[PDB]
Amino acid sequence: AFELPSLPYAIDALEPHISKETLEFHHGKHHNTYVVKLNGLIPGTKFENKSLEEIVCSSDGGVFNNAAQIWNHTFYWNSLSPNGGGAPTGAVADAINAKWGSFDAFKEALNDKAVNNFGSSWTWLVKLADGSLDIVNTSNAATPLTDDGVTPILTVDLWEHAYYIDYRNVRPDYLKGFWSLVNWEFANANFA
Amino acid sequence: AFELPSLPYAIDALEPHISKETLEFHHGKHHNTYVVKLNGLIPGTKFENKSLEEIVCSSDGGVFNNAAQIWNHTFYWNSLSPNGGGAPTGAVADAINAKWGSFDAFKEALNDKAVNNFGSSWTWLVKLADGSLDIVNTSNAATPLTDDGVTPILTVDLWEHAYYIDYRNVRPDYLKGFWSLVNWEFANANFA
Numbered sequence: 001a002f003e004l005p006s007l008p009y010a011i012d013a014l015e016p017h018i019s020k021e022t023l024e025f026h027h028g029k030h031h032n033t034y035v036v037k038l039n040g041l042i043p044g045t046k047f048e049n050k051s052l053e054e055i056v057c058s059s060d061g062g063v064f065n066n067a068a069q070i071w072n073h074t075f076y077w078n079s080l081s082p083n084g085g086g087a088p089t090g091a092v093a094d095a096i097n098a099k100w101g102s103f104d105a106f107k108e109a110l111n112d113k114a115v116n117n118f119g120s121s122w123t124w125l126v127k128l129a130d131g132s133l134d135i136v137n138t139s140n141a142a143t144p145l146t147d148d149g150v151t152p153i154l155t156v157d158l159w160e161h162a163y164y165i166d167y168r169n170v171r172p173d174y175l176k177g178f179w180s181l182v183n184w185e186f187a188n189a190n191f192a
Numbered sequence: 193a194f195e196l197p198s199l200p201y202a203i204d205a206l207e208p209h210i211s212k213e214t215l216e217f218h219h220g221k222h223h224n225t226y227v228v229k230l231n232g233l234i235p236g237t238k239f240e241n242k243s244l245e246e247i248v249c250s251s252d253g254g255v256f257n258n259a260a261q262i263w264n265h266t267f268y269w270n271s272l273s274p275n276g277g278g279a280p281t282g283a284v285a286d287a288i289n290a291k292w293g294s295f296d297a298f299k300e301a302l303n304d305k306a307v308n309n310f311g312s313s314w315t316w317l318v319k320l321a322d323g324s325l326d327i328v329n330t331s332n333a334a335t336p337l338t339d340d341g342v343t344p345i346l347t348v349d350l351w352e353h354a355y356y357i358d359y360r361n362v363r364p365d366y367l368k369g370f371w372s373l374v375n376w377e378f379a380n381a382n383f384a
């Protein structure tokens with residue numbers, strides 16, 4: 001059966017951007033629930049002995065919602081670090097300048113995509129077939145993991161549980177937090 | 193320009209089922225924002241002189257998400273009451289018995305529709321063209337108001353901001369509060 005991965009850092013490590021309480025609900029409860037629900041839908045079925053990724057790339061309805069959500073959250077914990085934040089570095093820093101002209105223009109373009117991402121959703125930094133970086137929004141459990149030629153680089157969870165405890169309704173406050181946490185090492189790893 | 197309607201009861205009137213703070217943010221901020229946004233989008237478009245309902249029934253993209261959310265939230269506040277809850281009465285009570293056999297079968301049916309309504313969404317009690325009752329789910333800003341010959345009777349908001357402050361991730365606890373606040377008079381007024 002699938003397991004809930006351990007968080008890549010201590011539960012208070014993202015303070016004060018993301019609270020210890022948010023992490024216990026978000027990772028300990030929400031992410032956990034997608035794991036048990038998936039574990040509850042696959043016994044006996046054809047997805048029974050497939051990896052998480054084979055499942056999200058070949059499933060539907062409830063099996064897809066849960067498997068994609070487990071995958072999205074794991075990627076999300078990885079896009080954050082108590083050692084991240086600030087200016088981008090390496091390959092991704094230059095790729096960002098190539099597409100948007102400057103990091104600041106990129107921040108503004110992602111923030112705009114994120115605040116207007118209606119309902120439960122995800123905003124992704126992705127690498128396209130032509131080697132270039134782009135920003136795409138998915139809704140509910142959808143993920144670019146399933147689009148040919150699109151490689152997920154970083155993600156920001158915009159479902160309301162991702163920030164309500166800490167920022168209530170103001171997404172820009174949450175996004176300011178994200179930027180202080182962005183894991184550029186994870187980004188560069190996915191990009192290369 | 194559209195206006196945020198007043199809450200139909202005091203900000204603490206739904207306690208201990210839905211808190212003063214949820215009402216302050218849910219009505220005071222979330223609902224308001226849909227109003228400001230919609231007002232921001234109408235000038236220079238055909239929706240220039242239309243009624244809220246005319247817009248939601250003939251709109252698309254952003255004009256629709258904002259207008260429908262205003263309509264939906266107005267409908268939701270009316271669907272609760274410091275004096276609701278408990279058993280259904282009058283015509284609605286009997287139609288529920290006609291369709292589901294018992295109030296309890298109906299309640300279990302709606303809870304199941306609601307807890308499984310994935311992402312931001314609404315679970316609705318509607319009166320169909322053939323006169324009978326049914327339960328339908330909509331996602332994000334969708335609403336039965338646009339379904340021809342389908343009459344909205346009661347709704348429960350399942351976007352996370354509707355309950356996260358008071359119940360975090362557990363929708364069933366939120367649903368317990370909803371059944372303690374159901375406004376059967378509004379349901380009967382809408383059904384009649």
Ligand SMILES: OC[C@H]1O[C@H](O[C@H]2O[C@H](CO)[C@@H](O)[C@H](O)[C@H]2O)[C@H](O)[C@@H](O)[C@@H]1O
Pocket residue numbers: 060061062063065308309310311313329330331
């Ligand atoms: O896993 C159960 C089902 O989840 C989804 O359907 C629910 O959520 C939808 C909105 O996201 C509602 O419209 C629907 O009424 C709910 O049943 C999924 O779409 C289904 O395929 C799953 O079986």
Ligand SMILES: OC[C@H]1O[C@H](O[C@H]2O[C@H](CO)[C@@H](O)[C@H](O)[C@H]2O)[C@H](O)[C@@H](O)[C@@H]1O
Pocket residue numbers: 116117118119121137138139252253254255257
């Ligand atoms: O009002 C702004 C737009 O809202 C919707 O589009 C946003 O939300 C979608 C998810 O619900 C995203 O996929 C999309 O990227 C966002 O722009 C609406 O569909 C648009 O028509 C509105 O213009």
Ligand SMILES: [Fe+3]
Pocket residue numbers: 026030073157159161162
């Ligand atoms: Fe999440």
Ligand SMILES: [Fe+3]
Pocket residue numbers: 218222265349351353354
């Ligand atoms: Fe709401």
